[PDB]
Design a protein around this motif. Sequence first.
Motif, mmCIF file in Angstrom:
data_model
loop_
_atom_site.group_PDB
_atom_site.id
_atom_site.type_symbol
_atom_site.label_atom_id
_atom_site.label_comp_id
_atom_site.label_asym_id
_atom_site.label_seq_id
_atom_site.Cartn_x
_atom_site.Cartn_y
_atom_site.Cartn_z
ATOM 1 N N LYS A 19 0.767 -1.207 0.072
ATOM 2 C CA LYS A 19 -0.141 0.101 -0.031
ATOM 3 C C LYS A 19 0.905 1.222 -0.114
ATOM 4 N N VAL B 223 -5.023 1.717 -3.681
ATOM 5 C CA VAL B 223 -6.191 0.914 -4.012
ATOM 6 C C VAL B 223 -5.814 -0.180 -4.832
ATOM 7 C CG1 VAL B 223 -7.533 3.323 -4.263
ATOM 8 C CG2 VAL B 223 -6.168 2.390 -6.341
ATOM 9 N N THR C 298 -15.187 -2.506 8.213
ATOM 10 C CA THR C 298 -14.091 -3.272 8.434
ATOM 11 C C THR C 298 -14.364 -4.020 9.523
ATOM 12 O OG1 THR C 298 -12.709 -1.978 9.588
ATOM 13 C CG2 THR C 298 -12.585 -1.781 7.214
ATOM 14 N N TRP D 8 -14.626 -6.596 3.076
ATOM 15 C CA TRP D 8 -15.171 -5.402 2.233
ATOM 16 C C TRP D 8 -16.546 -5.329 2.408
ATOM 17 C CZ3 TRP D 8 -11.790 -1.535 0.646
ATOM 18 C CH2 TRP D 8 -10.313 -1.998 0.744
ATOM 19 N N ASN E 253 -11.015 0.486 -2.153
ATOM 20 C CA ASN E 253 -10.257 1.598 -1.729
ATOM 21 C C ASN E 253 -9.755 1.468 -0.364
ATOM 22 O OD1 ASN E 253 -9.159 4.346 -1.045
ATOM 23 N ND2 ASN E 253 -11.246 5.175 -0.631
ATOM 24 N N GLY E 254 -8.376 1.256 -0.276
ATOM 25 C CA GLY E 254 -7.821 1.110 1.205
ATOM 26 C C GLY E 254 -7.229 2.436 1.771
ATOM 27 N N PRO F 244 -11.376 3.056 4.507
ATOM 28 C CA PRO F 244 -11.858 2.310 3.316
ATOM 29 C C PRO F 244 -13.094 2.622 2.695
ATOM 30 C CG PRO F 244 -10.630 0.879 4.922
ATOM 31 C CD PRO F 244 -11.177 2.162 5.469
ATOM 32 N N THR F 245 -13.515 2.559 1.327
ATOM 33 C CA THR F 245 -14.549 2.740 0.644
ATOM 34 C C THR F 245 -14.521 1.368 -0.531
ATOM 35 O OG1 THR F 245 -13.950 4.476 -0.796
ATOM 36 C CG2 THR F 245 -14.986 5.137 1.573
#
Length: 330
Positions: A149, A156, A190, A195, A318-319, A323-324
């Motif tokens: 990351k 991401v 989370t 996810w 999306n990390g 997150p999303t």
Amino acid sequence: STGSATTTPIDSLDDAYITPVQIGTPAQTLNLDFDTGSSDLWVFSSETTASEVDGQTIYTPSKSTTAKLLSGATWSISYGDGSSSSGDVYTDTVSVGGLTVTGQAVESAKKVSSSFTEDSTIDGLLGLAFSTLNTVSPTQQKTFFDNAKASLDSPVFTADLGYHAPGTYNFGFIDTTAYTGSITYTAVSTKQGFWEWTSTGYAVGSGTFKSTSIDGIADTGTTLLYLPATVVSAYWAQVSGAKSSSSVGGYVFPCSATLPSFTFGVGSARIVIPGDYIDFGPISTGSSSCFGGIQSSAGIGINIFGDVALKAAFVVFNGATTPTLGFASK
């Protein structure tokens, strides 16, 4: 940095997808099942019980000059389909589509259950859920994405699974040529290590959209779409002759049917799963009864947006610090 790798269906039904992964020095290339529903990177290996290997490519740590035994570490995992695997752990260099992580935990299988042995096309799994689910003991290990990351251009990865065709996993960037329209982002919990997000509702075929919250997980490692019994009954009621079969283990339908599409909500946006994506073919060779790609989650405890749903979209994992998930049509 970024990485980009093609992911390929293992069979004519899209039962799962394999992505080539380079492990060790010199590289040993294994075809792994990228699984956003788990958090262990494990491989068939030179340590796997010989009778449990049937055609897979194996990782041999003794031939890798960068492999190091992670002393005392073991792992053991059980998946929602009742399969399992276990073994010991090495650290080694792992590269996906040009993106390299050094010191990645590579979990070497000593034992695998029958369904893994029986699938010669899958050499292991690469988990992409949150590292809190990783099973290594006594020191939990990070996923490939978690380790990469900080080096990525953007924190991401994206899943672009094909219908009866290859697709792509990208790390560190969003390919704006790979989708149509805009990406709609939605909140992630989370708390269970997944996810996990909330769909805003559904429609069956050309029917009206039903606004209702459906909490579930985005899981590239699950083949089908598992939803509440009410939703699944409403879908299959539109297919003449469809029925839930306890003997088969879910909804089946006449192979002569044309299936309606299924739409799920992402915020105010809509992802349409074409009817054909919901056909998983004869229940046994030559049968005229076909297995449905939308099934009840009532026995699972969680709703699962598996490959049937995800391959209808371009999906952003999306990390970022919060997150999303993002979904776009394609």
